[PDB]
């Protein structure tokens, strides 16, 4: 699997 | 019982050879001291529990005596043992110098060939080599952090160093810049705290994760913004929620707090993940 | 030979004191380990070799022991030597920490007080100081470019840094932000290529003149539009003719080409003026 980074919320 | 100390003469003997001849002539009597030529050495059919002094550790003669099982040491071993009034080592294997005497090492997280090389050059420099980690080990040689042996050595507060330490010790010894393994500085060869770690974070604010990224890279590890399986070793996470956390849990990846990371920096090695789980 | 270790207790000892107290017990037995109050320290009156631990390096006790010539080191030297398995320095003078251990410096182009101050804080941070520039020198500290020592150090490709570096090393150390001199970035403290130069030009077109002024200011130097007596250190001039050239000569100002300027920028230090004469 691959999970992207939590974007600059 | 008495045992002869034979010096192998050749066309181009080194300065070390003659230096050892003069020191052994000055601190022991010449009664058990011979100088043998290459002819007489080649003709020796059997190991006669005598001590041979070769320089270098190569050539038809050295190969001959090594094959017979002879007790061979380099002249630098003679100079050393004479100067410090200490015994010549056992020498189950040939020993070229004593730069690494009193050093006992074990290895972990190394390629087989690299480990064999470390074993060879440590043995040639008068050190001892143990497969498993026992109390007499003075330094651990490691290619990555994390392993069970790594942790054991860390709990014993033993230096964990890179193969480069051995390489430098050897090279610097052949350049006649060092007599002893303490002459070079250990901290330039420490294993980095996160060498081999691939660290991801979740739930941290941007300043926190930039700090973690910076420190990770500084301490030899790799930082990843995105979580990639078959890559990430540690997911830093204070609160157990989110897609990153649950994905890491389904893949049995280390899920640790920030205290694992900063404690690892503070205490100087990669801490045990099991105490910092969430 | 004996190796006593006494610990000075006081009203306000730092956390370093207790950390060193707990760390020092894990090597040797408490046979040579003492805790002394200010009274018992005050009552001693002769140097008995031994190792004293003061924190801070001030007070009636510190003044007493220092003025007697005692061997004093700070607790951070204990923490460092323990952690890195290296020896405690000899220290004819008191040494407060090991942040600058393995650093050897010399100074040039400094005010007397500034040089003495740099000597003080470097010695206190575990570094060594040489009056003359020797191969073992690792960093040169300079207030201006130009001196013979500056050129020698530059030709050996040694770092030439500003006294502020020492100050940062000191301050960042007291704030417990750094353990080692490598934690701060050396490039941020380089000595500017033209620091101390006051540069004039003549014979250049306006675009060239403007470029030289811009770069001079950028690289730490001062620019002057008009050649003045004494004020100007270098007159850039390609051909030895004109009133500017002759006046610069009979004021003993360096008359160099533009190649001096741009070479100095390219190669990262103020070049030898004698090679660029006109």
Residue numbers in the entry:
A (entry chain C): 665 to 673
B (entry chain B), C (entry chain A): 7 to 284
Sentences from the paper on this structure:
Of the four peptides, only the one centred on 53BP1-pThr670 bound tightly to TOPBP1-BRCT0,1,2 (Kd = 1.5 ± 0.2 μM). Treatment with λ-phosphatase eliminated binding, confirming that phosphorylation of the 53BP1 sequence is required. These data implicate BRCT2 as the primary binding site, consistent with the presence of a hydrophilic residue −4 to the phosphothreonine, but with BRCT1 potentially providing a weaker alternative site. Co-crystallisation of TOPBP1-BRCT0,1,2 with the 53BP1-pThr670 phospho-peptide produced a crystal structure with peptide bound to BRCT2, consistent with the specificity it displays for that site in binding assays. The position and overall conformation of the bound peptide is similar to that previously described for the interaction of Crb2-derived phospho-peptides pThr187 and pThr235 bound to BRCT2 of Rad4. The phosphorylated side chain of 53BP1-Thr670 interacts with TOPBP1-Thr208 and TOPBP1-Lys250, which are topologically conserved in all BRCT domains capable of phospho-specific peptide interaction. The phosphate also interacts with the head group of TOPBP1-Arg215 which makes an additional hydrogen bond interaction with the side chain of 53BP1-Glu669. The side chain of the −3 residue of the phospho-peptide motif (see above), 53BP1-Ile667, packs into a hydrophobic pocket formed between the side chains of TOPBP1 residues Leu233, Gln249, Lys250 and Cys253.
53BP1 and TOPBP1 are multi-domain scaffold proteins that individually contribute to the genome stability functions of mammalian cells.
